[PDB]
Design a protein around this ligand. Structure first.
Ligand SMILES: [Zn+2]
Lengths: 60, 24, 206, 164, 82, 118, 155
RNA sequence: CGCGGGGUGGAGCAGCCUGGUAGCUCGUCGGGCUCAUAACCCGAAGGUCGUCGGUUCAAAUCCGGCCCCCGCAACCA
RNA sequence: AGGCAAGGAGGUAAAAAUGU
RNA sequence: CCGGGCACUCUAACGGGACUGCCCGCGAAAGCGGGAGGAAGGAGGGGACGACGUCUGGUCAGCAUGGCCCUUACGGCCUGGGCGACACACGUGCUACAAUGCCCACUACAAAGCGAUGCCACCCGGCAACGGGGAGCUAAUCGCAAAAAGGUGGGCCCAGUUCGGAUUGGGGUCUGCAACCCGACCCCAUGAAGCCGGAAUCGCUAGUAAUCGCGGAUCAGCCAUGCCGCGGUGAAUACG
């Protein structure tokens, strides 16, 4: 999450097979969710906060 | 069986379709 | 090592979300980001006003920003000036109709994040950490809490070995869903390191 | 260790080696069996997976017993250490010597050590004086393979029995 | 296993390098980083220094090795012996 | 009968018997039978010499099989080996080639197990 | 396992007769949870039995089971470093289960061709007083009787 | 010089002896166990029997040479 | 016949070195 | 299918229902054993939830920061390579060694997901991956999609084989600028070891082991046989 590898938020690819999503809270690389654009830690944190609307603790 | 990508069951396992297992 | 977040456990029931807006697969992502930005910005600004619930709705893309605070005066300005500036900033950031419906938290010692923030502030001034914690707890108890807890971990007042000073009052029933506990947390941004200020206030059941 | 005895053979046509070592050829299984029965000693298949199934016509059980006995005898032969010190008590020395002699008689080696500390002055000399004397005492029983060699903190000898 | 639909892929560096040195007759080591490309009939006879991540390594080039990408002949990893 | 280069099998369903050709597997054999006009439910012991011979002819004239096929594969390897190609190099080594991680289970290219002290 | 005597499952009995033993046997035969295959197998076996020894295979099966049923066998308890084949009783249901298991084993030890067939043959052998399962049972009994010495080391 | 006896997987030892049949322990490798090492258990690898050679249907085996090792008899040492 | 207790048996309680 | 209907399934909100409440037994009491009605009985099942603290457990490479250190360099950009290297060793899997199986051929039954440049009906070209045309949906309403084991029939006949599919040759399909390193897949050929595995050792107490398929998330494409998740068939045994 180097503030230099927010060359992803730099919209330009060169080839649209380089656009690699990223988290958009820490800017992690490795556990984004298309549905949130968040890393699997950041997302979790926000879920616990209650700041991703409708995201409950799961149970069935 | 299972593993063999030139049977029916193998095909099923591998996920795909072709000569041995058609769409129809 | 255990112990999950109390709010993020009681979030289909006792306490509703700190954001409320539907959006599809196409737009939850952008909107979420926007909301996060808003929250960040407000935090940066209203640290003086003492901020708690930073509620938001997209009610047909009319952003509703609700900041439950400690000082309406400070948010507002000296009659109604700084409230406007903040709103404008939000608009600039987040280009949609944006409100800023300020509510004070009457009983500022029922809002647990506020309490936590206060404690953090005190710590930053380098006080007797344990003493401060105890005082905070007592204050909470006085307010009308049916139980309180403050966990403060870290380099206590500038210590070389990690500790976790720890104090409580009455009932802090951290397992029952029916409990309804305001959990607050404040990051004590201090001079020798970083101190964790976790605060739990048990206000009341059902 | 263990071969197919007379009728334990379906290995068709067999290499009829007696307990004597003599070849009667490639008899039937059955013929060989008959012969064994007549001769009293079992056609034991010491190489069923060979140029004719190696039909060694000895009593199997008897053979096994013999082998067992031999093995037992082999055990009973071993290394016996006698560790002196630099300073010697004479009675003790004598006793040690006697023990060594006994061991040699039995058939058992006597590795004759000393125990040295540091103090390596007349330590090696003392060791030499001891071990060599001991050897002189019991030449009839053992002669020395290993002389009184320095072990730094020991002086080792090996008295090995004269005849085997 | 060979993997190009329609459009046998060669890079317009040493596509439009080596085709001009068709006019210059032969040429004298063509150094490339584009190992991606195949060995088209135009390359035949020349000498190509493909990139080994570190080396510009030479290949004298024949009519057999047409149906192959360049990085085949520049073996990048080294040794297996211990 | 010797339906390729001395390719005799015995006593099995025709297709299966054919499969014993170095040149042929379960699909080719099935195709071949369909082409030539021999019933799959028949045997090597139960086949008639006219119908034996048709198959023998067709198969031989249609594909490259057996010793020839072996030569071809060797030839291919040579083509790959002589030229300084990755695959050729791998072949020379005794290594796997096509996309295997070699670190552990390259064995059917490495043969049995040649353990070393650590 | 610690507290209670752990209840033994009551099944739906056979849908073709009304026999729990039969059901149990089928289950035992059944590997992988392929019952409506092993049920079929069982009925094929029964049919084979009928074809040969012309009694209602259910009774035959029962007889076979009875024949294989062991009454004393060997557990293993270490005592003084030595491990002992401790010859004790086998409890009724447990014994029955063991017998069933043995039968199944025998069926799959047999060199004959098909699923039903082997089982049928095994059952017939058991009824007779011979075969593989019965032999195993006998061996087990002997092991008890060869090691009746250690009996007193009861559990 | 004599005579005697010996020679076996890396080390110590059986087999020869009874012509067919190479074990045993210590070590070397790998694994298991254990928190970890030792020990422990399991495997695996590893000997053509000094050699020339003969035998003989076939030898570690029977025979000799030569090489040695061993003790003693032995002069210059 | 069961209730225990006191005694007397006899069986079983195997082994298994260590440490920045 | 349509009308027509909310009956039933459903779906989803809300309520009820199980409380040791009823009877007998013991027990001072709790409670326990047995009924009984009840869909369920004694915490019905499964979750979510993990105390004070330990392990100075793990992470400064998710982020947050204290201190230190680097600064035309330990920073920035890119191209290529490397992460995938392989005489070895272990870990976790998958697939197997067959005939309760294997191959084909028809035929039947799920849940839960997921779908917009996304899923793709259906039609044609192709052996086929797929390609072309092309409707539908914006999702219970169209689609992925056939679930498979199963059941009916055929075949195979106990072999290293129609077991098994590694590897290796060839030709292709797709995504993407680009599949050489290093993709998946199709087809044809190749047809390896392996005949249920030493000492050891792991998992599991009921809809569970075991086996069978289906979805997902990341994601162009995938090295997924992983992970998460759902249903199908479905046991054993527990003396102690
Ligand atoms: Zn993040």
């Amino acid at each position: 999450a180097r503030k230099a590898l927010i060359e992803k938020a730099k919209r330009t690819p060169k080839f649209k097979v380089r656009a690699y999503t990223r988290c958009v809270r820490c800017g992690r690389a490795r556990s984004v969710y298309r549905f949130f654009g968040l890393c699997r830690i950041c997302l979790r944190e926000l879920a616990h906060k209650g700041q991703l609307p409708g995201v409950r603790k799961a149970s069935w | 069986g299972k593993g063999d990508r030139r049977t029916r069951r193998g095909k099923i396992w591998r996920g795909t379709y072709g000569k041995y297992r058609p769409r129809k | 090592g255990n112990k999950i977040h109390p709010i993020g456990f009681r979030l289909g029931i006792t306490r509703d979300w700190e954001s409320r807006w539907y959006a599809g697969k196409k737009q939850y992502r952008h909107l979420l980001l926007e909301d996060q930005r808003i929250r960040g910005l407000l935090e940066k600004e209203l640290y003086s006003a003492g901020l708690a619930r930073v509620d938001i709705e997209r009610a047909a893309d009319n952003v509703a920003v609700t900041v439950h605070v400690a000082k309406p005066g400070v948010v507002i300005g000296r009659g109604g000036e700084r409230i406007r500036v903040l709103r404008e900033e939000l608009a600039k950031l987040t280009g949609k109709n944006v409100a800023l419906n300020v509510q004070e938290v009457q009983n500022p010692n029922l809002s647990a994040p506020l309490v936590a923030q206060r404690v953090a502030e005190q710590i930053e001034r380098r006080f007797a950490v344990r003493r401060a914690i105890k005082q905070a707890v007592q204050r909470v108890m006085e307010s009308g809490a049916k139980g309180a807890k403050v966990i403060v971990s870290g380099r206590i007042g500038g210590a070389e070995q990690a500790r976790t000073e720890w104090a409580a009052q009455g009932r802090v029933p951290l397992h029952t869903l029916r409990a309804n506990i305001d959990y607050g947390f404040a990051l004590a941004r201090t001079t020798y390191g970083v101190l964790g200020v976790k605060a739990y206030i048990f206000l009341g059941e059902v | 260790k263990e071969y197919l005895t007379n009728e334990r053979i379906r290995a068709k046509q067999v290499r009829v080696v007696g307990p004597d070592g003599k070849q009667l050829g490639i008899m039937d299984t059955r013929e060989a069996l008959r012969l064994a029965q007549e001769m009293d000693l079992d056609l034991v298949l010491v190489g069923p997976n060979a140029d004719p199934p190696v039909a060694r016509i000895m009593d199997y059980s008897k053979w096994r017993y013999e082998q067992q006995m031999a093995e037992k005898e082999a055990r009973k032969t071993e290394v016996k250490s006698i560790k002196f010190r630099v300073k010697i008590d004479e009675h003790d020395y004598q006793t040690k010597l006697g023990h060594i002699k006994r061991f040699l008689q039995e058939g058992h080696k006597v590795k004759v050590t000393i125990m040295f500390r540091g103090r390596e002055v007349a330590h090696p000399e003392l060791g030499e004086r001891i071990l060599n004397r001991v050897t002189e005492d019991l030449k009839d029983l053992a002669v020395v393979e290993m002389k009184p060699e320095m072990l730094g903190r020991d002086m080792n000898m090996l008295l090995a029995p004269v005849k085997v | 296993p060979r993997s190009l639909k329609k459009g046998v892929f060669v890079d317009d560096h040493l596509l439009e390098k080596v085709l001009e040195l068709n006019a210059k007759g032969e040429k004298r080591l063509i150094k490339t980083w584009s190992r991606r490309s195949t060995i088209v009939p135009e390359m035949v006879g020349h000498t190509i220094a493909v990139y080994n991540g570190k080396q510009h390594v030479p290949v004298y080039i024949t009519e057999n090795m047409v149906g192959h990408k360049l990085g085949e002949f520049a073996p990048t990893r080294t040794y297996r012996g211990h | 009968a010797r339906i390729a280069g001395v390719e005799i099998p015995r006593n099995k369903r025709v297709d299966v018997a054919l499969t014993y050709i170095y040149g042929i597997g379960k699909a080719r054999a099935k195709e071949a039978l369909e082409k030539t006009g021999i019933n799959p439910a028949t045997r090597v012991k139960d086949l008639t010499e006219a119908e034996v011979v048709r198959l023998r002819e067709y198969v031989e004239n249609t594909w490259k099989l057996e010793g020839e096929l072996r030569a071809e594969v060797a030839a291919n390897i040579k083509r790959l080996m002589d030229i300084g190609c990755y695959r050729g190099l791998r072949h020379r080594r005794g290594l796997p080639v096509r996309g295997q991680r070699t670190r552990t289970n390259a064995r059917t290219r490495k043969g049995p197990r040649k353990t070393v002290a650590g | 396992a610690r507290r209670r005597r752990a209840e033994v499952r009551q099944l739906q009995p056979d849908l073709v007769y009304g026999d729990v033993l039969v059901t149990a046997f089928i289950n035992k035969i059944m590997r992988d949870g392929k019952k409506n295959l092993a049920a079929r197998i069982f009925y094929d076996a029964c049919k084979i039995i009928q074809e040969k020894t012309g009694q209602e295979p259910l009774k035959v099966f029962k007889q076979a089971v009875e024949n294989v049923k062991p009454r004393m066998e060997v557990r293993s308890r270490r005592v003084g470093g030595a491990n002992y084949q401790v010859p004790m009783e086998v409890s009724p249901r447990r014994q029955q289960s063991l017998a069933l298991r043995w039968l199944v084993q025998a069926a799959n030890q047999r060199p004959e061709r098909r699923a039903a067939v082997r089982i049928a043959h095994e059952l017939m052998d058991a009824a007779e007083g011979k075969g593989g399962a019965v032999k195993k049972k006998e061996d087990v009994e002997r092991m008890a009787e060869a090691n009746r010495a250690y009996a007193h080391y009861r559990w």
